[PDB]
Design a protein around this ligand. Structure first.
Ligand SMILES: *[C@@H]1O[C@H](CO)[C@@H](O[C@@H]2O[C@H](CO)[C@@H](O[C@@H]3O[C@H](CO)[C@@H](O)[C@H](O)[C@@H]3O)[C@H](O)[C@H]2NC(C)=O)[C@H](O)[C@H]1NC(C)=O
Ligand SMILES: O=c1ccn([C@@H]2O[C@H](COP(=O)(O)OP(=O)(O)O)[C@@H](O)[C@H]2O)c(=O)[nH]1
Ligand SMILES: *[C@@H]1O[C@H](CO)[C@@H](O)[C@H](O)[C@H]1NC(C)=O
Ligand SMILES: [Cl-]
Ligand SMILES: [Cl-]
Ligand SMILES: [Mg+2]
Length: 330
């Protein structure tokens, strides 16, 4: 392969598969000097691709803030919300609205926020003291010691899956979502309790996208050069969040070593499911393109909804407030 990622992944494929055969890629954290000579036009690429390619083989990052007994009592649903250090208003609105922990019929919902580091080296304002004050006051902050960037989000996925393997392998289901999304948690709990025991074992639902490919428009957010990745993407769910079983979370983590990190986290999770022999299932309750504006103020449009992107902190509280009495009028 000419594309860098496709080639290195097929090297991993031969490493983990003896039949394909007729410098740790996992904890070598020095800059990989060889990329500058092997990818055409390296020093003319954006800075994010240069950082992603130089340190592709480093993923043994450690927890700086932990909540090791978040799942001391077995949870039915684990809410894992990706967040950024300065997003205090988002995390707080999620705490008071749809991400509040509960135990209705002893079906335990627990919440964690997934953060990286916003170090001063990137000219980030020092907010660590307030993050500590929030971490001890709410005990829902998980934070590793890597640069929380847009191209390091697949690293956030892997590190979160390791935390589930270590501190929460007993949870029945996992919802992984964004901090700018509204989630009808009541509707998700109803859906989980309506599943067959067979379907619940390998659950993985979301706004699934088939036959997608990298965006070549350099001006786009998810732009991927052809020197980096070639071909089509595997089926994957994205756009705000997906829902799956705890059994599948343990299987997903244990093949992550066999898949190279990718600048798009949702594509990486899709690559991981495809190697397990599974296909993510499309569920139309994940309204990643929002809902029609003529209904954006009708609370009945949120009742049988799983997820809607996107919402500001005030709207999450407003919608969740109106949702509590929607059964008396919807
Ligand atoms: C994902 O997170 C990792 C860990 O935070 C980032 O790795 C870090 O990358 C920076 C550069 O972006 C490295 O600093 C550089 O060090 C070299 C000398 O080796 C120096 O010449 C540069 O001026 C700069 O100081 C840092 O060492 C490295 N840390 C680790 C632990 O590997 C990575 O960049 C992030 N990826 C993305 C796409 O943001
Ligand atoms: O470096 C980053 C950038 C994004 N996010 C999280 O990603 C989610 C949504 O990101 P965004 O809305 O920018 O993605 P988009 O909707 O544009 O695809 C939010 O939870 C952010 O906190 C993150 O954790 N680290
Ligand atoms: C990963 O482990 C190696 C030891 O093989 C070590 O040299 C490296 O610094 C570790 N990386 C991180 C980010 O801790
Ligand atoms: Cl079913
Ligand atoms: Cl609608
Ligand atoms: Mg978003």
């Amino acid at each position: 392969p000419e594309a860098y990622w496709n080639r290195e992944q097929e090297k991993l494929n031969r490493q983990y598969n003896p039949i394909l055969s007729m410098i740790s890629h996992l904890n070598y954290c020095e800059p990989d000097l060889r990329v500058t000579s092997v990818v055409t036009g390296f020093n003319n690429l954006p800075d994010r691709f240069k950082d992603f390619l130089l340190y592709l083989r480093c993923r043994n990052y450690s927890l700086l803030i932990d909540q090791p007994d978040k799942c001391a009592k077995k949870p039915f649903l684990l809410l894992a919300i990706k967040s950024l250090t300065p997003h205090f208003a988002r995390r707080q609105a999620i705490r008071e609205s749809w991400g509040q922990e509960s135990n209705a019929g002893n079906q335990t919902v627990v919440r964690v926020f997934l953060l990286g580091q916003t170090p001063p080296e990137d000219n980030h304002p020092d907010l660590s003291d307030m993050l500590k004050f929030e971490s001890e006051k709410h005990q829902d902050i998980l934070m590793w010691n890597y640069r929380d960037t847009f191209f390091n989000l697949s690293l956030k996925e892997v590190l979160f899956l390791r935390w589930v393997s270590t501190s929460c392998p007993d949870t029945e289901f996992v919802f992984k979502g964004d901090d700018d999304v509204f989630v009808n948690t009541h509707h998700i709990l109803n859906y989980l309790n309506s599943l067959s025991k067979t379907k619940a074992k390998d659950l993985f639902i979301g706004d699934v996208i088939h036959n997608a490919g990298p965006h070549r428009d350099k001006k786009l957010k998810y732009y991927i050069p052809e020197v980096v990745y070639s071909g089509l993407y595997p089926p994957y769910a994205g756009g705000g969040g997906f829902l799956y079983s705890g059994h599948l979370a343990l299987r997903l983590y244990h093949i992550t070593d066999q898949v190279h990190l990718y600048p798009i986290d949702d594509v990486y999770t899709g690559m991981c499911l495809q190697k397990l022999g599974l296909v993510p299932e499309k569920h139309k309750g994940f309204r990643t393109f929002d809902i029609e504006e003529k209904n954006k103020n009708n609370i009945c449009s949120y009742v049988d909804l799983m997820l809607v992107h996107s919402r500001k902190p005030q709207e999450m509280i407003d919608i969740w407030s109106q949702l509590q009495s929607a059964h008396l009028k919807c």
